[PDB]
Design a binder for this molecule. Sequence first.
Ligand code: FAD
Ligand code: FAD
Ligand code: CL
Ligand code: CL
Ligand code: CL
Ligand code: CL
Ligand code: CL
Ligand code: CL
Ligand code: MG
Ligand code: MG
Lengths: 469, 469
Amino acid sequence: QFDLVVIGGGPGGYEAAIRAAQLGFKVACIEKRIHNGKPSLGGTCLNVGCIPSKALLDSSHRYEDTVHHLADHGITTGEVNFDLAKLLARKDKIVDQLTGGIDQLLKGNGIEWLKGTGKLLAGKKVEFVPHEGETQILEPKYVILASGSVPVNIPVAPVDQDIIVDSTGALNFPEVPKRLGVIGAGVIGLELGSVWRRLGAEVVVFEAMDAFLPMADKALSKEYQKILTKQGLDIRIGAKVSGTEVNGREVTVKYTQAGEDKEQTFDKLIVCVGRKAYAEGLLAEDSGIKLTERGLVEVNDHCATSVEGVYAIGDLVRGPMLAHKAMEEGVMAVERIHGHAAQVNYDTIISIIYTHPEAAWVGLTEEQAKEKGHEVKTGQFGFAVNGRALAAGEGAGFVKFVADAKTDRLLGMHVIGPAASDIVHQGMIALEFVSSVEDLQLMTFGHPTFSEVVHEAALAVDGRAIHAI
Amino acid sequence: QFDLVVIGGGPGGYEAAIRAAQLGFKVACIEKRIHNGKPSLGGTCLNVGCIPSKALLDSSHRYEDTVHHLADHGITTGEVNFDLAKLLARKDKIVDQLTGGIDQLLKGNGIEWLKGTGKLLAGKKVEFVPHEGETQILEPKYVILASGSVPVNIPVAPVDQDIIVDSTGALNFPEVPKRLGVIGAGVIGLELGSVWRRLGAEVVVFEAMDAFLPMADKALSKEYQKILTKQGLDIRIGAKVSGTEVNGREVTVKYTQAGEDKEQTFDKLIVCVGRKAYAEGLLAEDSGIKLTERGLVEVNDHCATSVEGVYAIGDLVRGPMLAHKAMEEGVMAVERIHGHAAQVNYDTIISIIYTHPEAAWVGLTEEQAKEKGHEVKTGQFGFAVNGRALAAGEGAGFVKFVADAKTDRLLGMHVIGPAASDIVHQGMIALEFVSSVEDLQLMTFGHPTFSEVVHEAALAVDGRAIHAI
Ligand SMILES: Cc1cc2nc3c(=O)[nH]c(=O)nc-3n(C[C@H](O)[C@H](O)[C@H](O)COP(=O)(O)OP(=O)(O)OC[C@H]3O[C@@H](n4cnc5c(N)ncnc54)[C@H](O)[C@@H]3O)c2cc1C
Ligand SMILES: Cc1cc2nc3c(=O)[nH]c(=O)nc-3n(C[C@H](O)[C@H](O)[C@H](O)COP(=O)(O)OP(=O)(O)OC[C@H]3O[C@@H](n4cnc5c(N)ncnc54)[C@H](O)[C@@H]3O)c2cc1C
Ligand SMILES: [Cl-]
Ligand SMILES: [Cl-]
Ligand SMILES: [Cl-]
Ligand SMILES: [Cl-]
Ligand SMILES: [Cl-]
Ligand SMILES: [Cl-]
Ligand SMILES: [Mg+2]
Ligand SMILES: [Mg+2]
C-alpha cells in the first residue's frame, strides 16, 4: 500500500521519492531503465547524460592539458598517449558506483523501487508492469510524473547508433573519429564536440539558428564563441542540415548556408539539437491530465497538474531542462503535497557549460532586464590580470553583473572563467537574498582567489574597481 | 603637495591610495622595497608572499598530477621531468608583470609613488628619504600606516638565506633539496613544504605547539592533518627546536618532543614560525602614537590610531595577517577619513590554505560558537559521493556548517576539497546576509557541481541530506 507513487527514477523522481519518505509517506518509485543488463536509477543525468559527459570532459581536459599546457611550467613528458577504452571504462565505473548509490539510498529510506513501467490511470490509480511478473494496479492518493526527456529527432539525419549517433552513442565511440560533425551548438553539442576535439577529432559544430546561445547574455556568448573557436572548435553558424548520405564508414552532410547548398563528409555524426519531453505510455486516455500543444504536461508554478494530487516535474514540464531544476521541482511537489508552500524560484536557476574554461550564468541577461522595464547598469572585470589566474595559467574570461540603476538591485551574473560553475553560486546566493550591488561591494573576498574578480566586477558596476585602468 | 600620505605599498597601502584617489584626494604612497635590483610596489603579498607561493604551488601540482594522476584516466607519458630554473622563471615573470601593473595603476589614478622610506614625525609630518634624491618633509592632512610584516626570527635557526632560509629563500632554491626540514606547521609551512615535496624532497615539518592548526575547526584540522600526512608531509606535533647545526652543506635540527631529545639532518631548512608587525623607521619618538604589548600600533575597530588623522592597517595591526584583511582595512580607513562610518566585519574574514586539496573556512568554529553561548548544531557532507568530484577524480574532503540550534542562524563554514577557496565565499556571503540554515536549504544549487555539497551539508544540519547513507 503506497501513499505516493513516483513514475520515473531520474533526478526529479528519486529526489521526490526520498523527500516523501523523509516526510512519512509510503513511497514507490517506478523506473524502467536497464543499463548494461542492470536495472538502474539516476535517469538521463546519471546514465547517459550529465555524469558521463562530465567524466569525459575531465579526462579529455587532462590529456589536452598534458600535451599543451606543461611547457610553460618547465615540465616535459616525452610521448603522451591515451587509451580510449580505459578512459571510457573509468566513466562507466563512475556511473555504476553512483547508480548503485541511489539504489542504496532508496532502500535505506524504505522506498520500494518497482522495476518496470508505470502508467497513470483514472482516479489516480497506477498501472505497474514489471520487467518480470504480474502487473499491479496501485491506488495511491498522490502521484508525481517524472518521465523526463529523450533527444529531438531530425528526420533527414536519422540515428543508427553507428555512423549517425545521438548523445548516448557520442559518449561511447570505440575509436576517436578523424572527422566529426555535430548538429546543434547548444550546451550538449559544445561539450561533446570539445571532448572529441581534445582527443584528436577534426570537429565541425553546426548551428541552424542565426544566433549562438540565444538564452545567454550577449556579451557572454560573443566572448565565449570567440574563446571556443580559438581552441579549435569550429562552430558553423547559419547552417541548416537538409540531408545526410551514409556511404560505408562515412557520412556526407548536406546543408544550406548563405542561400547555397553545401556538403561536408565526416566519419561520425552526432545529432544533438535539443531534447523533448518523454511521456510514451505515461498516461491512460482517461487520466484526466491536460496536455499542451508542444507535447508537455501542463502544470502551474508549483508543478501541480489539472488533476488534484498529481504533480509533474523535470524535463517533462516547462522550464530549463536541467538536472537541478528537476531535483528542486521534485522536492517542491512533495512539500506541496504535504501542505508546505514550497516554491522554486525560476529566476535563480543556474546554467553551466562544462567546457574549459567553463561558462555559467544566473538571473537576467542585460537584454532581459531591459525588456522587463529596468533602467540597467552593468559592470564586468576580467581574469586576465587576476593574480590567482596568472599563477594557475587561466587568465581568460570575466565576471559580468547586471543591475537596476534606480534601486541598485542585483539582477544577473554571467561568468566565463576558472571555477565558473562554483563562482556563479555566489551570485545565485546573492540573488536569493535580494542583494544590492552595494552589499557585494561591502564584503571581503579572499586574495589571491578567482572569486575576488566577483568583487571587482561589483565595484565596476559603479565604475570604481580598484585594479581597473 | 598631498592630502593623504600612505606609508607602505603593500595590499593595504596601495588599495588605500587608489580608493583615496577615487574620492578626490591628492595622494602619495611611500614604498621602499627594492626587489631584483629595481623599486617595486605590491609589498609582501606580490613580491615574496601570496603570488610567488601560488605560482610554485600550481607548477608543482601540475608536476605531481602528471606523474601520479594520469593513469586512472588512461593517459600515459614518457619520463616526466621539470627544469627548475624555468619553473622559477615563470614565477618571476608573473611577479614582474604584476608589480609593473600596480605601478601603472597608481599613475593612472594620479597617485605619486615616492620611492624610499617614510617616517611619521610629530604633528602628522612625514619624512620622505628617497633612494636617490633630496630628502623632503611632507605636511599631509591624513596619514595611513601600512608598513606590513616580516618573518618571525629565531636565534636558534638563523637565516643565512642559503642553507637556512625564510619564506623568501624557500621560493628560490636553485635545486630541489633531497631532505627538507620546515620549522612551523602554519599555512606558510604547509604550502612551502608541499611545493618541494611534490618536486621530490623528503619533507619533515616541525610544529612547536601540541595542536595542529588550533584556529581551525577541530574536525577540519583532524582530517586535514591525516590528508597531508598521507601525501608525505611528516608533520611532527609538539616538536620544539632547541638548536641547529650547520656542517658544510647539511644542517642538523636538534629538537625535543614527547620528553625525548632528538635530531635529524637535512640539506635545507625553512624557518616559517609566523610573521610579526614591521615598524622599523616608521615612527619618530615624538609621533604621538600609542602601543599595546608585543609590537603593534594600537587602533580601534575602524583602524584609527591615538593621533587624529592617522590610521594604521594590515599586518601592522591586530587581526588575521591576511592580504584581503589589509586591503579592506585600507578602504575602511580611507572611507572613515572621508566621513563615512565604514566597518570591517572580522567574523566574516576568510582563511585559505592553498595546498591540494585546498582548505578554507570562515566564521566560527564549533568550539568558538559554544564558547560564545550558542546551543550548537552542525552538519557535514563529503565530496567522496559527489558526482562532479568523482568525474574529476577529486572525491575527498567535506563541507561542514556550524549553526545555532535555537535560532537556526548560520555561524561558520569549514571546507576541505575541490574549489574550497571559491566555495567558502558562498558561506561568507550567507554570513554577511545573516542567513539561517533554512535559507541555504531552500536554494537551488547546480548539478553536477562541487557546490551542491554545500546544499547537502546545509540539509545535514537538520539530518535530512537527500544523498546521506
Ligand atoms: C548528454 C547530456 C548532458 C547533460 N548535461 C547536463 C548538465 O551538465 N547539467 C544539467 O543540469 N543537466 C544536464 N543534462 C540534462 C539532465 O540529464 C536532465 O535535465 C535531467 O536528467 C532531467 O531529470 P528528470 O528526472 O526530469 O528526467 P530523466 O533524467 O530523463 O529521468 C526520467 C526517467 O524516467 C524513466 N521513465 C520514463 N517513463 C517511464 C514510465 N512510464 N515508467 C517508468 N519509468 C519511466 C526513464 O527511463 C528515465 O530514466 C544533460 C543531458 C544530456 C542528454
Ligand atoms: C610566503 C607567504 C605566503 C603568503 N600567502 C598568503 C595567502 O595565500 N593569503 C593571504 O591572505 N596572505 C598571505 N600572506 C600574507 C600577506 O602577504 C600579507 O598579509 C599582506 O602582504 C599584508 O599586506 P600589508 O599591505 O599589510 O603589508 P605588506 O604586504 O608587508 O607591505 C608593506 C610594505 O611596506 C614597506 N615598508 C615598511 N616600512 C616602510 C617605511 N617606513 N617606508 C616605506 N615603506 C615601508 C615594506 O617594504 C613592504 O613592501 C603570505 C605571506 C608570505 C610570506
Ligand atoms: Cl541529447
Ligand atoms: Cl546513438
Ligand atoms: Cl543580453
Ligand atoms: Cl591555526
Ligand atoms: Cl572546533
Ligand atoms: Cl608594543
Ligand atoms: Mg538567412
Ligand atoms: Mg539590504
